[PDB]
Design a protein around this nucleic acid. Structure first.
Ligand SMILES: [Mg+2]
Ligand SMILES: [Mg+2]
Ligand SMILES: [Mg+2]
Ligand SMILES: [Mg+2]
Ligand SMILES: [Mg+2]
Ligand SMILES: [Mg+2]
Ligand SMILES: [Mg+2]
Ligand SMILES: [Mg+2]
Ligand SMILES: [Mg+2]
Ligand SMILES: [Mg+2]
Ligand SMILES: [Mg+2]
Ligand SMILES: [Mg+2]
Ligand SMILES: [Mg+2]
Ligand SMILES: [Zn+2]
Ligand SMILES: [Zn+2]
Lengths: 116, 50, 46, 88, 179, 136
RNA sequence: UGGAGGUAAAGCUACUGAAUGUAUGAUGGCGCCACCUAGGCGUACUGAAUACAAUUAAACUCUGAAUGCCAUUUAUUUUA
RNA sequence: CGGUCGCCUCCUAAAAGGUAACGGAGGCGUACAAAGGUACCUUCAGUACGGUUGGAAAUCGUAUGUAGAGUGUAAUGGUGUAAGGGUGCUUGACUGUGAGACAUACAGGUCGAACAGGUGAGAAAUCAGGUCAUAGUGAUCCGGUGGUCCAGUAUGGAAUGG
RNA sequence: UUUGGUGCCCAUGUCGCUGUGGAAACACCUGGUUCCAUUUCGAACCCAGCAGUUAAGCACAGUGGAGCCGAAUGUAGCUGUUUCAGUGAGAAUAGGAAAGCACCAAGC
């Protein structure tokens, strides 16, 4: 009836609405977007509507789509967030079920000093 | 008025601490819920009391 | 999906006149069941 | 002669529920004060504004209340409480 | 399936050459064969419905999901929340296996498979086959429901034009009158 | 007797006839028309009387249009009844004619007969009528 | 200066009802046949739906004020 | 004489609110251990086409359609990724509270941030002190029932009270 | 600047029609042996890879067809005082309209 990306966009609209409705402490938002080839991550701030930190397979120059490079992406983005002195984050998926690459990246971010 | 109310009492101190509603005609089985108890100061099973 | 009691096993199918052992997956007996009217044994197709 | 008269059947009315807007734009407000009471969300909630069990909008922080118009054909209304933001 | 490879090579080349299709995947592709054997007898003799599923089960290799009506009708004794009808949707290898088994074993056993075509496409490229009797299907033992029924095998395709669906059918040799 | 087939509410509030002309202000089916100059309530009985008058004084090929329709009903308490104990029952339907509404229009017959016909139609109605023509 | 609203007005292809004419017309009534059931050719005429032109409403609204109301800003006045 | 007496929805009610009449229309004295809570997934009705039983209309496939569908109910308002449907786990359908407001003659009613205790869902953020919201309800006195760190008419009990 | 992602917006952002495109990326695609999944279907979700692919989607140019928006004049209702001064709609129209504002990653 649709294509996978539109359903992923639809789930993202739900998640964005929920986070913007309930995030009272104004935490930074760690958005991960997964594609068929690669997965990227960017930390927006919904109060200013800008990007504070970013990371991607293109940025990191990896043949991604594997759980191994997902560990590297999470480590890089968590390192960047620590350098930015922001540790209170909210984690949302691109509209995909939290599992596999998304779960590995999220768990990888947690052991490098993030609190979520 | 109709009487659909029932009392829920703890199963440790046997004290009645909650008041709820139940349809005896539809639901035939006794409630065996678990709620907070002021005396025991913890969560414990609460059953229907006549 | 899997874990079923009805196994789809690749069974061969023979026919009269023309042998034509067509192998098709089905959940039946594992032997050469002979069909009396197959596709090729019909005046309509040929 | 009166010949008698029939009887009327509808002379019944209910108590008026005190709904509507309570705080006007520009009025200062503390947390927990009502800004809009409604039956069904006639005014959407924004930032620093909550909801109740009767669809009642209440504030969550100090500031000036503020209405924002949004939605298709500009048919949706939204309220918010822009914090004092004195910020020295 | 060997005929699956036959489908790949033959359909690709001929359709592409037949219409100068600029890409191999421009050719139409068949998607899913839905089977829907539904009966309202589940309103009174529910037992029958169960047996129905098993025969359907025994035919395709997918257990059938029983469907429920979205309305309620007094004349049909229908009411919401009841199971009236099973639907099965085959994909991947199993769909081609069942399709091949139907056209080669089940279909030519039909008492009078004279066929109907050209007047069957829904205008979007689909195709429905209304089977009249169940006993003709090889995957069925003589013991069955006290009532015998048919089937409503249907087809889907990647293309949206009914003519291109017919062209794929001709390339696949689905045996109907002139179509 | 023009009558609405059904109505949602039997006893509605009356609709004022004071004001200018909302719709049905200009001849748009024929080309000669009978305008009103004083808003009043006129019932389907007067409409039917006027229509029968027009039809009787028409010819074999003349054509006529009735714009107004008696949409609104009115009540009347039974005689010898003191006020109270609810509203009376609906009795007759009247079409609300405001100052400037074209009620009847005629075409397809020579000018003198249509002018006379509109005169006889307006003598059956209480409002003071007037003839107007259609802009080219 | 800012706001809430849905009245007056207006509109009904923007809904719910009511409702006029023209054109195409489902539909029935009415016939005349064949056929005992599948139907067919015209329909004094009823009238779905569509298009054009025109209507009505406290409990109709795709719209839509003024006044009034609340708050604030400035000026003045009174200790209510 | 007939009719009505409490509470909820719409109009009259004149675009803040309020506003009466033996003015015009209706309902309620409930329903849900799921129709609550959470996490995840998902989105009309109708109509067109194509198809055995099967028929105007049961189910299937596809398209169209922007709400005429659903939201237990009388209306109103709201809500089409929602507040509608399905699934998994549960019982926050918690305890002690409660700054601040509304409306009000009073009595009563309504919303609620936030704190402590111990839980449920969820990776977490978060949500949960009953349901999309407004009717589903009756003061005091009197007596009965359970618990109880209070009293016990000289003292110990009991009776009788709190 | 362009591509890809996303927030803000909520049709002058749509629906549709005609063409062009891919370097990198986006996508279809290749398989279900692993984590995970179907009220049944690896369709979807989830895996691991880019063989093929520019139909799609997606991105560009044209398209005033449908939908949407809509000036000025005039008028209806309003406030006063007049029996005239402001306020000024709705409908209709000329007409506009093939979105716009920011952030991030890459060759630029
Ligand atoms: Mg009221
Ligand atoms: Mg009016
Ligand atoms: Mg209308
Ligand atoms: Mg009105
Ligand atoms: Mg009496
Ligand atoms: Mg007022
Ligand atoms: Mg009012
Ligand atoms: Mg209702
Ligand atoms: Mg649940
Ligand atoms: Mg619910
Ligand atoms: Mg007494
Ligand atoms: Mg003593
Ligand atoms: Mg292309
Ligand atoms: Zn206890
Ligand atoms: Zn043979």
């Amino acid at each position: 009836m649709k294509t996978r990306t539109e359903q992923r966009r639809l789930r993202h609209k739900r998640i964005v609405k929920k986070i913007r409705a309930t995030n009272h402490d104004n935490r930074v938002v760690l958005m991960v977007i997964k594609s068929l080839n690669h997965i990227s991550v960017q930390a927006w701030d919904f109060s200013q509507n800008i990007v504070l930190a970013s990371s991607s397979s293109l940025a990191l120059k990896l043949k991604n789509g594997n759980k191994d490079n997902a560990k590297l992406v999470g480590q890089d983005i968590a390192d960047k967030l620590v350098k930015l002195k922001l540790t209170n984050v909210v984690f949302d998926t691109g509209g995909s079920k939290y599992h596999g690459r998304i779960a590995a990246l999220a768990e990888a971010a947690r052991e490098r000093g993030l609190n979520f | 008025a109709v009487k659909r109310s029932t009392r829920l009492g703890c199963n440790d101190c046997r004290e009645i601490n909650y008041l709820t509603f139940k349809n005896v005609k539809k639901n035939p089985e006794k409630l065996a819920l678990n709620k907070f108890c002021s005396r025991c100061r913890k969560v414990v099973v609460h059953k229907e009391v006549k | 999906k899997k874990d079923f009691h009805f196994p789809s096993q690749s069974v061969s199918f023979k026919c009269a006149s023309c042998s034509n052992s067509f192998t098709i997956e089905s959940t039946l007996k594992q032997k050469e069941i002979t069909i009396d009217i197959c596709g090729k044994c019909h005046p309509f197709y040929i | 002669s009166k010949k008698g008269v029939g009887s009327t059947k509808n002379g019944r009315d209910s108590h008026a529920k005190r709904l509507g807007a309570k705080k006007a734009d520009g009025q200062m407000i503390r947390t927990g004060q009502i800004i809009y009471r409604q039956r069904g969300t006639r005014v959407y909630p924004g930032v620093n504004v909550g909801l109740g069990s009767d669809d009642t909008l209440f504030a969550l922080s100090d500031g000036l209340v503020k209405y924002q118009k949004f939605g298709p054909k500009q048919g949706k209304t939204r309220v918010s409480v822009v914090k004092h933001k004195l910020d020295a | 399936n060997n005929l699956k490879a036959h489908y790949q090579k033959t359909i690709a080349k001929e359709l592409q050459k037949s219409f100068a299709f600029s890409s191999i995947m421009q050719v139409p592709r068949l998607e899913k064969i839905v089977i829907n054997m539904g009966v309202g007898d589940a309103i009174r003799d529910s037992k029958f419905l169960e047996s129905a599923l098993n025969e359907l089960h025994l035919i395709s290799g997918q257990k059938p999901v029983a469907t429920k009506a979205k309305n309620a009708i007094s004349t049909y004794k229908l009411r919401a929340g009841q199971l009236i009808g099973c639907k099965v949707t085959l994909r991947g290898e199993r769909m081609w296996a069942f399709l091949e088994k139907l056209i080669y074993v089940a279909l030519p056993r039909v008492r009078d498979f004279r066929g109907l075509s050209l007047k069957s496409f829904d205008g979007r490229g689909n195709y429905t086959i209304g089977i009249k009797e169940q006993i003709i299907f090889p995957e069925i033992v003589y013991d069955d429901i006290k009532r015998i029924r048919g089937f409503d095998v249907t087809l889907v395709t990647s293309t949206n034009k009914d003519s291109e669906a017919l062209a794929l059918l001709r390339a696949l040799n689905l045996p109907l009158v002139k179509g | 007797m023009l009558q609405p087939k059904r109505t949602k509410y039997r006893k509605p509030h009356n609709v004022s006839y004071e004001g200018k002309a909302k719709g049905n202000s200009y001849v748009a089916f024929g080309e000669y028309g009978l305008v009103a100059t004083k808003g009043n309530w006129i019932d389907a009985r007067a409409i039917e009387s006027a229509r029968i008058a027009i039809s009787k004084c028409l010819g074999k090929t003349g054509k006529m249009w009735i714009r107004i329709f008696p949409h609104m009903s009115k009540t009347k308490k039974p005689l010898e009844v003191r006020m109270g104990s609810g509203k009376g029952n609906p009795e007759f339907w009247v079409a609300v004619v405001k100052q400037g509404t074209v009620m009847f229009e005629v075409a397809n017959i020579p000018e003198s007969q249509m002018i006379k016909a509109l005169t006889r139609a307006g003598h059956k109605l209480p409002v003071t009528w007037k003839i107007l023509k259609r802009e080219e």
